[PDB]
Design a protein around this motif. Structure first.
Motif, short mmCIF file in Angstrom:
data_model
loop_
_atom_site.label_atom_id
_atom_site.label_comp_id
_atom_site.label_asym_id
_atom_site.label_seq_id
_atom_site.Cartn_x
_atom_site.Cartn_y
_atom_site.Cartn_z
N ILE A 139 22.79 -0.34 -48.42
CA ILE A 139 21.49 -0.16 -49.04
C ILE A 139 21.72 0.31 -50.45
O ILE A 139 22.40 1.32 -50.66
N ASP A 140 21.20 -0.43 -51.42
CA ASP A 140 21.54 -0.13 -52.81
C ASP A 140 20.94 1.19 -53.33
O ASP A 140 21.55 1.87 -54.15
N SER A 141 19.77 1.58 -52.81
CA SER A 141 19.19 2.86 -53.18
C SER A 141 18.20 3.38 -52.15
O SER A 141 17.19 2.73 -51.87
N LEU A 142 18.49 4.55 -51.60
CA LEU A 142 17.59 5.19 -50.64
C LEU A 142 16.41 5.87 -51.33
O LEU A 142 15.48 6.35 -50.68
N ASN A 143 16.43 5.92 -52.66
CA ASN A 143 15.36 6.58 -53.38
C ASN A 143 14.02 5.88 -53.15
O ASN A 143 12.97 6.48 -53.31
N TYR A 144 14.08 4.61 -52.78
CA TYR A 144 12.86 3.82 -52.62
C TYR A 144 12.17 3.98 -51.27
O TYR A 144 11.05 3.51 -51.09
N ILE A 145 12.84 4.61 -50.31
CA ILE A 145 12.25 4.87 -49.00
C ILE A 145 11.56 6.24 -48.94
O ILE A 145 12.16 7.26 -49.30
N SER A 146 10.31 6.26 -48.50
CA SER A 146 9.56 7.51 -48.34
C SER A 146 10.30 8.55 -47.51
O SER A 146 10.92 8.23 -46.50
N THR A 147 10.22 9.80 -47.96
CA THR A 147 10.89 10.93 -47.31
C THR A 147 10.51 11.08 -45.82
O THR A 147 11.36 11.38 -44.98
N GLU A 148 9.24 10.86 -45.50
CA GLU A 148 8.81 10.95 -44.11
C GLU A 148 9.33 9.81 -43.21
O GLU A 148 9.21 9.90 -42.00
N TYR A 149 9.93 8.77 -43.80
CA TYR A 149 10.46 7.64 -43.01
C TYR A 149 11.98 7.61 -42.96
O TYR A 149 12.54 6.83 -42.21
#
Lengths: 221, 223, 271, 271, 221, 223
Positions: free
Chosen positions: E100-110
């Motif tokens: 996964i190139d960047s986890l920054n794009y996934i919401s914290t609650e998910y």
């Protein structure tokens, strides 16, 4: 001369539609408020006092109206205040003093409206804001204290006078952690008067106040 | 488009471009154009202690009404404010491109609703922009001064207007009109920096062509 | 004054804009350009247009760089959220760039009133995107796309996050063109006594994000001390966070600092 | 050890709880008491009950203070959001306070499940209030009210602000009684490397607010250095932010610092 | 020995279901990711690579599946990933690598749900989180970075290696103001490996990496 | 109420009050009661590097199952967790009030659904409290060990549970049951401090009767 001025604001002789008192845990404003009352009676100007209470549970002896605001919605609050004051258009009515015990209880988005609604030629407002009680557009909208200092025609910044070893800085650091030292909330205290003149040129002086002998002295800082 | 024999207009020393007097002698020279070029805008920033910036606002406005009053110098002043006593507080006087005003004397005849028009900042942004467009379009062939006497005064600007998309949308939209009718429109705004957070102030400055800081009146500028 | 001029060089093949970024079958490259309010980027934008359309930036460089042996259908799409079209057409005409070589998209003029006001977030982003698609689909393989101040959308569109702006606009836009230049105003980083507010942390993420996706980053800054007559500011050339997309692993950014003087007519670089 | 005991004195008339706060027609007074987790306040609560009901805190003081010449209908209403009723009845019985002199309101037992869960903010505050009204309206002019940890409501009730808690519960409660004692846990101020978060700034406002409304403030703290055998902590007596409500302007808080040892049986004060 | 270990994690020989790469503007993670790919092929373990992209617009040559996630909702993302992987219950399938190139794009609650959903005996996840991209319960809920470090079975903290006058502290201060110095994003860089063993006792070592000559050396700190 | 000839119960040296073994020899002495008094609770705090705190959690649980297995020592263990392999990872062994456990040997017969019951923290607070009440009430006359193996583990506790009114409401409600059936209930919880903000940790600590900090295993306690 500067002591003369402060005596003129406190007696409500030097008219100022909105007088903002800033206070804190170290030195609340109730003594300062009793100076307004004292100097008012003293210098002949005995005005009707409308007292708005959010946290004042003992009705002051000096007030003629007392509004318990805790249960009231904003518009309902305004309507009560307004009904005790003269018609903003009368051109022949007695000057009223409105005291609000704490502006901290009014929402930031309603502050300017509130001030606009109570404003009246026949009315002067003394309201206190506690410096150490903390509050989509809120982000950019000015915080309550910046706002209130901007709207005020006069500001009275109350501070403790320290008889002991600590100064006012080290004490505010102690209060930040709710460590309460002895020797706060005294009969002698100090204040910083900011008065906004007609030009915009703002005056600013510091004073020692003795709420026991209702005597003030300039502070040579 | 405008008239060539217009007395309120003149080419700047720095450029070929048409410019107009701020109504403030000194201020004109500092801008670097001996005035404010048409199709441009200034934001004047001031500290809390009033009111040197509301003075330059009034000069800017007064300069336009005099022009309108005898070739020609037709102009129309648009004021974005709730205080309509702005029009009655404008200074009186004393080519005919700049005048020396007197802060103590008001203007001889009071400005008529056809010389100057108010728009309230207590309205939706869509509405404000519509008014300004519409006023510009119906005073076609008139030089147009837009004055925003104190951007974001909390007593005039509703809390919700302080949301970025509102105030910056407003400023973007006004800037869009200034460039759209660059032929004859100019914008002056002032703001008190003590009630603006630095981020918002940064956004605001970016919508204006020039920004002037006043420290007491000494002027440090950002062209 | 009588300063010693330097030619702008950005890559190790000695070029500013390697033409081979453009005929490749599958590659997408991002320049991220940052400037402060006191250092306008127009001369840089016009230089890049000129280099792409005419082979070399005559406005910046004394000598010419290696170019293609015949004129192509090289095209530039210039878009701005802060300047109207006249701003570019006037300077491009002064620079003598022929009109058929570029297209200006104006997202200042009537933009709030026609395109933002009665219109939801996705629809706004979707219709801005669509303007670029149409414009690019004329010389799709040979067009440079330059966007001035897309960050403004973070302020103009209510509740737009950096991630939505990237996902629904920036990243899809980069997918449809060979070279994307993003020009952004970096004043938000330059406030004395101020760091990391919520609207501004959302805004700052856009700069960190664009840098991470960029293979090259150019920064214009004013003198750190004050303002001068015959000195405008500095120009830094840096690696971005992404690798260059080419079948040419020798190619690299040539990191550099220049001083520049942006004169009315021409702009000059000097060490 | 063999330390030199002091009697607790809070006011200038030499008393801990001046009985004249209670027959007055129109006065309301607030004690604000603060303690840390390692310095439990029970011995203070029981001392105040004892002083009000029996005239002097025999558990703290060696000698007796001036008291009323006949037994009254003096009553205490003890409420807690953190301890069950057994906690107080067991210690009060050990202390030999007769049961008819007090009433315990339990806001721990089944409180979340019966009183918070399927129930809106106002209704929760309104029904807690109502419990106090009923209890006070038995010797309304002669009852001391003591509330342990009402701040918990700021954590237990979703989206309760300090101002609502004051307006809808604290301030109305203070209006219905002669003397209110609020006992609050001040650990939130005592985290090394931590100041002023949003839920906690809402929480901290409650302490500043209570102090401002209080005419006296008592603080229990542990030794600043560590924990000992025969030393529990310190007790500070301070002025509050409000004036004392009496027709006796000479009356003042006697500010003081004590050390105390809270032994299983008795507690002792010493300088 | 410690260099042996890092070579074992990078080749996916030392199994670790979730490998978290921390990076920043000063030194992004793409080079580190190419080390995983290189060491994988090298040490015989040539696994199918499923690449999830939020900001990677050029499809890497080494991947076998490429998912453009920018347009996809969370559940729809999970369903795509899942359909390219073996049945979590197969007991006889090839091991897949998910990047996964960047986890920054996934919401914290998910985040935890996402990790729970992709977790599979036949699957190892390498995901990067950018340290300098900033994010009713959010207040108390752990921030993305604290959360991700807690969930990771292995952590790889990437840092720039400074050839010039400044160290990594002064540089992070420069980047905070978006002042980009020369000499970032190099072929030689450093990393801090945290590996969580079965006891809970966590290992921690620093390394210099040469993404040109795929050679690593312990760092005697 | 309980049985007097119960082997898991004994009066503490410090007090007259009934207490129980943590299942951890050393830990019992440190508490100051040679165990955990009935009607009380401990919160054990640990740094990130596992898993000494999940070990004391398992000891605490194991101690209760052994009691249940031959006078008498009836107990029921309630586990608030999503990991049901907690019951299969409990250590085996080797008055009869404390035992010496072996972390390498599991428990001889596996715990039955009637000796130990799981409750998921992925449910509403109302529901969790109902389950715990209901389980306590139907195992009347049984000593009751409530174990919360890792409070607020993000993989087991939904984001919305981290809202103060949820987690503290949960802890308040559990504390309420512990005091309500002080006759026979006891509570052990552990938590990893690296994923808890200090404010929340302060709130949490206040619901427990004692708090134990583990630094590697050395125990600094707050009675």
């Amino acid at each position: 001369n500067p002591v003369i001025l402060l005596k003129r604001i406190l007696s409500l002789t030097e008219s100022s539609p909105f007088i903002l008192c800033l206070d804190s845990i170290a030195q609340t404003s109730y003594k300062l408020i009793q100076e307004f009352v004292h100097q008012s009676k003293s210098k002949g100007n005995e005005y009707p006092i409308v007292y708005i209470s959010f946290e004042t549970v003992n009705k002051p002896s000096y007030c003629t109206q007392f509004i318990d605001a805790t249960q009231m919605d904003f518009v309902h609050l305004v309507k009560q205040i307004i009904s005790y004051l003269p018609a903003a258009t009368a051109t022949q009515a007695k000057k009223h003093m409105v005291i609000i015990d704490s502006l901290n209880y009014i929402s930031t988005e309603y502050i300017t409206r509130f001030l606009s609604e109570i404003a009246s030629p026949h009315c002067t407002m003394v309201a206190t804001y506690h410096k150490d009680i903390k509050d989509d557009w809120n982000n950019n909208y000015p915080d309550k204290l910046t706002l209130l200092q901007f709207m005020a025609t006069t500001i009275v910044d109350i501070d403790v006078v320290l008889t002991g070893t600590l100064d006012t800085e080290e004490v505010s650091e102690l209060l930040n952690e709710f460590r309460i030292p002895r020797g706060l909330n005294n009969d002698i205290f100090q204040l910083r008067l900011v008065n906004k003149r007609k030009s915009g040129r703002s005056l600013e002086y510091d004073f020692i106040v003795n709420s026991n002998t209702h005597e003030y002295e300039l502070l040579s800082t | 488009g405008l008239d060539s024999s217009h007395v309120g207009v003149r080419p700047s020393p720095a450029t070929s471009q048409p410019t107009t007097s701020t109504g403030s002698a000194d201020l004109d020279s500092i801008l670097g154009h001996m005035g404010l070029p048409l199709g441009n805008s200034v934001l004047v920033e001031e500290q809390s202690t009033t009111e040197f910036h509301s003075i330059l606002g009034k000069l800017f406005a007064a300069q336009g009404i005099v022009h309108n009053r005898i070739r020609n110098g037709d102009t129309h002043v648009i004021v974005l404010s709730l205080n309509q006593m702005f029009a009655k507080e404008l200074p009186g006087i004393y080519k005919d491109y700049n005048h020396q005003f007197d802060i103590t004397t008001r203007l001889m005849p009071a400005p008529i609703a056809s010389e100057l028009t108010f728009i309230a900042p207590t309205q939706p942004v869509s509405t404000i922009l519509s008014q300004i467009e519409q006023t510009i379009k119906r005073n076609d062939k008139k030089l147009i001064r837009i004055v925003i006497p104190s951007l974001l005064h909390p007593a005039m600007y509703p809390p919700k207007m302080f949301e970025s998309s509102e105030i910056i949308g407003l400023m973007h939209g006004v800037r869009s009109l200034v460039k759209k009718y660059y032929e004859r429109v100019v914008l002056f705004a002032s703001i008190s920096i003590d009630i603006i957070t630095p981020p918002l102030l940064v956004l605001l400055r970016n919508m204006f062509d020039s920004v002037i800081n006043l420290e007491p009146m000494t002027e440090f500028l950002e062209r | 004054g009588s300063v010693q001029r330097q030619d702008l060089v950005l890559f190790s093949d000695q070029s500013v804009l390697p033409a081979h970024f453009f005929q490749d079958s599958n590659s997408h490259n991002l320049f991220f350009i940052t400037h402060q309010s006191c250092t306008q980027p127009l001369w840089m934008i016009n230089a890049l247009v000129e280099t792409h359309v005419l082979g070399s930036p005559s406005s910046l460089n004394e000598s010419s760089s290696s170019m293609l042996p015949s004129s192509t259908r090289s095209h530039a799409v210039l878009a701005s959220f802060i300047h109207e079209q006249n701003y570019f057409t006037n300077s491009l005409n002064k620079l003598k760039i022929p009109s058929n070589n570029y297209n200006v998209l104006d997202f200042l003029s009537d933009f709030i009133v026609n395109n933002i006001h009665n219109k939801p977030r996705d629809k706004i982003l979707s219709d801005v995107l669509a303007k670029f698609s149409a414009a690019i689909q004329n010389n799709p393989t040979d067009t440079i796309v330059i966007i001035e101040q897309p960050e403004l959308l973070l302020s103009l569109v209510s509740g737009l996050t950096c991630s939505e702006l990237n996902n629904k606009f920036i990243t899809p836009l980069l997918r449809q063109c060979k070279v994307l230049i993003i020009v952004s105003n970096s004043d938000i980083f330059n406030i004395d006594e101020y760091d990391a507010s919520v609207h501004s942390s959302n805004l700052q993420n856009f700069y960190k994000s664009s840098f991470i996706k960029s293979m090259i980053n150019l920064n214009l800054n004013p003198l750190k001390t004050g303002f001068a007559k015959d000195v405008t500011g500095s120009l830094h050339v840096c690696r971005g966070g992404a690798p260059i997309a080419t079948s040419n692993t020798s190619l690299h950014v040539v990191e550099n600092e220049y001083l520049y003087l942006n004169e009315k007519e021409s702009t000059k670089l000097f060490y």
